[PDB]
Design an enzyme around this catalytic site. Structure first.
Site, PDB file in Angstrom:
ATOM      1  CD  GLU B 341      -2.480  -1.518   2.528  1.00  0.00           C
ATOM      2  OE1 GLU B 341      -1.974  -1.050   3.568  1.00  0.00           O
ATOM      3  OE2 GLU B 341      -3.488  -2.245   2.540  1.00  0.00           O
ATOM      4  CG  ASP B 365      -3.086  -4.355   8.494  1.00  0.00           C
ATOM      5  OD1 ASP B 365      -4.266  -3.958   8.373  1.00  0.00           O
ATOM      6  OD2 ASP B 365      -2.155  -3.988   7.748  1.00  0.00           O
ATOM      7  CG  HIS B 531       0.673  -1.010   7.906  1.00  0.00           C
ATOM      8  ND1 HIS B 531       0.562  -0.112   6.866  1.00  0.00           N
ATOM      9  CD2 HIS B 531      -0.231  -1.985   7.652  1.00  0.00           C
ATOM     10  CE1 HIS B 531      -0.386  -0.557   6.036  1.00  0.00           C
ATOM     11  NE2 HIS B 531      -0.898  -1.692   6.467  1.00  0.00           N
TER      12      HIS B 531
HETATM   13  C1  LIG Z   1      -8.924  -5.118   2.140  1.00  0.00           C
HETATM   14  C2  LIG Z   1      -8.623  -3.919   3.034  1.00  0.00           C
HETATM   15  O1  LIG Z   1      -8.677  -2.722   2.266  1.00  0.00           O
HETATM   16  C3  LIG Z   1      -7.264  -4.046   3.720  1.00  0.00           C
HETATM   17  O2  LIG Z   1      -6.245  -4.216   2.748  1.00  0.00           O
HETATM   18  C4  LIG Z   1      -6.983  -2.808   4.560  1.00  0.00           C
HETATM   19  O3  LIG Z   1      -7.830  -2.804   5.694  1.00  0.00           O
HETATM   20  C5  LIG Z   1      -5.531  -2.769   5.024  1.00  0.00           C
HETATM   21  O4  LIG Z   1      -5.284  -3.840   5.928  1.00  0.00           O
HETATM   22  C6  LIG Z   1      -5.191  -1.441   5.681  1.00  0.00           C
HETATM   23  O5  LIG Z   1      -4.000  -1.531   6.442  1.00  0.00           O
HETATM   24 MN   LIG Z   2      -2.869  -3.227   5.761  1.00  0.00          MN
END
Ligand SMILES: C[C@H](O)[C@@H](O)[C@@H](O)[C@H](O)CO
Ligand SMILES: [Mn+2]
Ligand SMILES: C[C@H](O)[C@@H](O)[C@@H](O)[C@H](O)CO
Ligand SMILES: C[C@H](O)[C@@H](O)[C@@H](O)[C@H](O)CO
Ligand SMILES: [Mn+2]
Ligand SMILES: [Mn+2]
Ligand SMILES: [Mn+2]
Ligand SMILES: [Mn+2]
Ligand SMILES: [Mn+2]
Lengths: 589, 589, 589
Positions: B341, B365, B531
């Site tokens: 991300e 996470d 995270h």
């Molecule tokens: C599927 C979700 O968008 C997931 O990827 C998110 O919640 C992500 O864990 C954010 O840190």
């Molecule tokens: Mn995530």
């Protein structure tokens, strides 16, 4: 709800339910669960948070679940349009951080992330807070310790305590904005806190500062600028309910009977005028005094008194006592936060506790520290129980809310309740336990009547004080503890050698064996001013939250560390030394 | 040695043998001993510190002993031409403070004074450190606790630890300077950490910032801009070693067979393209794409993914999983620190631990805090061992280095080793314990393959997070702990109601009973972001030393205070409260 | 009035009629006159200031005159509920300073004191401005130079100018708050201004930051996520009104006929998708794309383009050209401030001038400075008129609002008018004077159509640039001047050797003989970036007033000092050197 005394409406709490933006799957499956989460919070706050007038706080829920910036902006428009002064975000799933943030930097905000397994609710909580900390917009984080199943509309106890503490603190902060602090008179006997620092009111509380010389009281009394109908009613009430105690002035210092009758008249008029100045009086319009009728929209005020006024006119003990009480000749009502000796800082200290509890606050001098050794040497008695380690004598120089008698009762225990919970017996008992004494003319040549009472012991209380220190700004000190009862003969001995015609409260602070709470002596030795504010209950944790919102560090307090609830950003400035982090966070943010 | 992937060479450590400039007897009798200290330190370091390619760190010793400014300048000159990025001064006697100082401000420096009685070695240490503190040049001080006999070249155990700790942190710091952070795509779902603050990269790490829109992947995929021969081998390798687990999407959300095959193809191409972007690919030049061939000289990168890209193309799970791993279709190799991300802050978090250990880092996470009460309700099972006080669910949204299985072994224990220590069995088992599951289309509409594994328990680990807070700048948080095993059936229940197709690691942090570590819950409630980076082993102390060199304060950590190794000047900002001192020292220096 | 494109309503201007609170004669005789000033100011503003949709600005007057804090609070309350974002205080007499002040810190405020002899109007002006300066709340002071007779409601010319100037700048400032800046793609070819510094948007403009990878355009184009019926009309409109000029790519670089047709299709789709992203599209919801329908509530956006996107797809010239124009296949409409190469700083530059004039802004590169000696050498022609001292070539890399032709006319002069004042002829001629040329494939490999026109001369214009400098923050530069005409043959030579398929505007800045304006060259050598925004008319003064409200210093401008209108407090930081005072005032306030 219209504010019954001040311009505009009472602050409302807006609930922002955020949701995952993905449709055709995710969003539709959480639309009801998320919205129900918001309603549960609204229901909780409405049943636990009340405006100073007894009405339940009103909540506003966003027209839709916020999943993007468009819906977030529509929420802001709606909240701003409906007078929201506090915001709370709730969600059970993952939401697009900054896209769903409340960007209003001018309102207390909190985020409640559902501790569920099915969706990344706790992940959004930490994500959006990381955002808040990074943008410099403080926000509180609420996360329950135990996992609940999807849709559980029953809010767990740890979550409840945080939502309510946040709500009350936030509501109190929102309540001060736009209001005035009326300064009646100027600096009193060189007392630092009686000097007005507008920077504090404007920048820290968003308040206005109004000023009026005490000569105004002369004009209004001479020209009869006040409700004469009400006056006669109040004069009659005082004669029927206020018991005059023995005169302690000795010959040469004793005012005549005639003087004492005028002393009661002026004192009553003083109470009427001080109140008319603070919130206005429409009755003055038909009397030809339209400007005076207006009022100063003040939610807090102060009266200088000594030396200029008291050297000639009756003092303000009665006025200062009655205004702060929760009742008078017009029946039970909310108090009018009035500061003795125009100690505006002590006025704010009182205001903080008032807005957090809706109950009268006691203005008081930190007069004497009584060590177990001294009480023994003087009375022969050995302090026991909560007083076994020494006591602190809190006693203002003559004025104190009748609520301070501690005669108000709930479940057989001494307390101070919001006016709207008072019973006819509570009021009568407070009045009967009080004795008005002729002012000590050696100090107050103009005369007057001081409030003489002894606070019932065993009542949990919290004393606090806001101070302004050069190079630091405003800073708050808190001390939770209890009131104590001494045997009648012991009280009499300690009381007679101090000032027996003034109100008395025997206070013992909870010790922690650390910081400035190592012993009773240290609590007083560290008090930063001669004055303090006494509030019923243990509202220290509440005060701490409120202060963090206002960005006012807390230099001293004895609240257990687990109760400390501050914006998420504080933890980034330190986690081992919260006091240190508090200063770093307040200054930087 | 030449850096195998990035421009230039690998940083070298320079040793400065300082001596008493006085001839006529003193210096003539100390040159051999001094040089021997330098030689001893170089030998120690070459046997304990290694570049990310397994090659031992290379040291450079001054051509002569340093007893004055001329010789000091000579040393500086040589080190600069030899590419030194970390310096260690050594001495068994007194030397002339500032005359012998290493004045380079951009190089981590430490000084080791021999604990001998014959000469004032320890006296030089304190004298020169005071100099570095006065001039504002942080320097680590190393003093042995046990007196050694003159000439003893056996480096004591307590000195070895600090020398190595300093050397590793310094090397990691020197490794980043000049390197780039590649940002592929932009902000992801409003995650604060996906915003790029160039100021941080340039001023704290001395790194460059490169950017490339994800549409670049479209161009390269469509126009076949990548090694087609490698692609085939890669596709064939995936089919023989990557097991495809059950599809959890419910009929209305299942992708056809054709799509799933394309998903694999594009996923493999994505891996190649991402890597080609980070370090270039000579193969691209031959194909006629010379600009593309060059690469972005990035030692760390990130990939936005959601929402834009994943709403149409296969997600980056496989790409993010394979790149971070210590092996692929081309065999064992150093990892490619890659952020999910495009969370650059977590990328740096991972890069930190990677440069301190040479091992793959796990992106994840902080999903759920499971209290014992919660697990007892949901499973009827009582948490035992390290899990008795609760556990934290660490599970990234679909990607994680295969090293994260914990299938790699050393002395019958689960670990993550540097790629160069991997056995074929290690690799084989990591793949065996992993299942590639079809992406959840409700979240990732374009398909893909998430990584599904369960990290083995009993493995020491350290999770960390770098955050940027307004009014403070960069701040690091650390939490050492262990991974745990849960009964097979207990795990299934907890896993199924969360996200079974994502990688799971059950984490239990070490508690201190104070601060953010009074209990498991507090550790998660104090995490400043969604995270974290998981690294094998207990590297908190190493991280602390690294952060002090970068002047980045550590707001939260459970590292024993005796293990804290910071520049000498830090203690000048306080000894009673290291946290407060860390902030004061980071800010002023 | 409701904002037609963005969430919420359009900002309103509030008028505060302050008066002497003294009754018994004074106030009773001044209410009518005071209210009349307010009414006069509202009438003036409604006839001269207009929202971006052509609707006259809406004013709100306090329910009563303001002679104290109560009435002041009442006013604040009303304005807040009426959505006021700009306030103007008016009075013909003395009032009680702070008691009548507008204490809102987030609202541009001005005070107009009547220049009458009967009452101390001018005395209140200075008294209350001193208050605003002491409290740190910037406020504009408006005092007429000629004494007017009591009751005169005719607003003098010098007062009208300031009232209108303040009103326009304030409105522009209020217009941005709450709106979003949409970033499509990331950094473009290392251009500093394509980096997004959220701090600026949030703290100076009170705007939100939205981000979306260009890959989103791929998804929407591939999946037809856009109004297919509009697309057709749009394609048909382009073919009937957009002339395709000669292709300058040399054979080895020419795109086939099929490609050129696809280039048109995708270019038109790009326009629709970009617009749908900025303000949403109800049509998308009907099509099943509800999230996409919402939009990003962006009043300004940018498109990266090179290198990633243009290396494969058609460039954004047409998209960037049509969006910024005041008309398209749907007729005349307000523009969509759109930044080329995602240069958000130029986007804001354009947004500034757009909100101050309601006209299309021209995005452009400061390409070449042509000295008279240079033009004489290259053409043998001697520059005359405004061009005699040299000219600057302003020409963006391929995109520019069609308004940039200068074909629009008013009183036989070339101008750019607000879309609502456009005649069909204006539109027709803008298209006629424009040629769409096939993109230069050596630069834009994916094709496209650049805009080719020649702005008509003699048109007053103002070019501006906002830059962010480390250690200072945002800083604005302005340069008023004129467009010029060059002999047809002289222009061709200069144009052909530069970039003939891009839009050209020959610019000549006004010189002052000092500072950055001693000569034409100096103006370009002092431009802090490669881009600028061109606005029709001389709006430097308006920009200066707007910048002072935003607390953004102006490092360079050629606006006559007599026209400089800044908050009263500015002069407290200096009167002899306004530039130095601007910086001091911006920094401290
Ligand atoms: C599927 C979700 O968008 C997931 O990827 C998110 O919640 C992500 O864990 C954010 O840190
Ligand atoms: Mn995530
Ligand atoms: C009579 C005295 O001035 C008394 O009012 C003061 O000592 C006061 O208590 C100071 O807080
Ligand atoms: C074609 C070129 O890249 C051109 O677009 C750039 O030079 C641009 O003008 C930079 O501002
Ligand atoms: Mn007192
Ligand atoms: Mn008594
Ligand atoms: Mn599994
Ligand atoms: Mn350009
Ligand atoms: Mn042309």
């Amino acid at each position: 709800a219209k504010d019954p005394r001040y311009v505009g409406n009472l602050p409302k709490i807006g609930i922002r339910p955020t949701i995952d933006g993905r449709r055709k799957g995710v969003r539709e499956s959480l639309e009801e669960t998320t919205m129900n989460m918001a309603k549960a919070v609204a229901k909780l706050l409405e049943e636990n948070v009340f405006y100073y007038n007894g009405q339940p706080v009103e909540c506003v829920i966003a027209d839709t679940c916020i999943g993007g910036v468009k819906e977030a902006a529509e929420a802001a428009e709606k909240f701003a349009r409906e007078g929201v002064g506090v915001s709370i975000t709730v969600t059970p799933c993952w939401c697009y951080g900054t896209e769903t943030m409340d960007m209003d930097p001018h309102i207390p905000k909190a985020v409640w992330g559902f501790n569920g397994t099915e969706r990344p609710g706790a992940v959004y909580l930490a994500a959006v807070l990381a955002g808040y900390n990074q943008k410099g917009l403080p926000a509180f984080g609420i996360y329950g310790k135990d996992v609940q199943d999807a849709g559980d509309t029953n809010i767990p106890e740890d979550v409840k305590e945080k939502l309510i503490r946040f709500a009350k603190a936030g509501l109190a902060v929102a309540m001060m904005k736009g209001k005035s602090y009326l300064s009646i008179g100027s600096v009193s006997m060189g007392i630092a806190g009686s000097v007005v620092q507008e920077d504090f009111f404007q920048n820290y509380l968003g308040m206005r500062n109004e000023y009026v010389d005490m000569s105004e009281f002369v004009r209004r009394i001479e020209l009869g600028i006040y409700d004469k109908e009400e006056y006669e009613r109040a004069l009659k009430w005082v004669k029927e309910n206020c018991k005059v105690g023995p005169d302690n002035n000795r010959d040469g210092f004793k005012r005549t009977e005639e003087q004492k009758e005028k002393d009661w008249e002026i004192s009553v008029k003083m109470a009427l005028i001080a109140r008319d100045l603070m919130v206005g009086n429409k009755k003055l319009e038909e009397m030809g005094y339209g400007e005076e009728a207006l009022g100063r929209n003040a939610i807090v005020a102060g009266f200088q008194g000594q030396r200029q006024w008291t050297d000639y006119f009756p003092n303000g003990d009665f006025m200062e006592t009655i205004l702060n009480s929760s009742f008078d000749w017009n029946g039970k009502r909310a108090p009018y936060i009035f500061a003795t000796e125009n100690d505006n800082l002590n006025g704010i200290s009182m205001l903080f506790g008032y807005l957090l509890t809706n109950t009268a606050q006691i203005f008081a001098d930190v007069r004497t520290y009584w060590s177990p050794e001294a009480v023994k040497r003087v009375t022969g008695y050995t302090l026991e129980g909560r007083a076994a380690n020494g006591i602190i004598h809190l006693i203002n120089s003559g004025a104190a809310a009748l609520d301070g008698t501690g005669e108000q009762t709930k479940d057989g225990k001494p307390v101070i309740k919001p006016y709207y919970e008072l019973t006819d017996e509570d009021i009568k008992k407070c009045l009967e336990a009080t004795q008005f004494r002729p002012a000590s003319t050696e100090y107050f040549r103009g005369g007057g009547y001081s409030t003489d009472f002894l606070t019932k012991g065993g009542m949990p209380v919290t004393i606090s004080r806001l101070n302004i220190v050069k190079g630091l700004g405003p800073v708050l000190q808190i001390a939770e503890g209890y009131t104590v009862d001494l045997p009648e003969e012991v009280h009499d001995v300690l009381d007679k050698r101090t000032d027996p015609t003034w109100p008395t409260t025997w206070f013992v602070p909870n010790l922690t064996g650390e910081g400035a709470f190592k012993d009773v002596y240290s609590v007083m030795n560290n008090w930063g001013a001669n004055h303090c504010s006494i509030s019923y209950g243990h509202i220290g944790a509440d005060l701490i939250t409120l202060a963090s919102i206002l960005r006012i560090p807390v230099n001293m307090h004895n609240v257990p560390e687990e109760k400390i609830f501050r914006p998420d950003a504080w933890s980034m400035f330190g986690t081992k030394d919260l006091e240190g982090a508090d200063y770093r966070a307040c200054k930087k943010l």
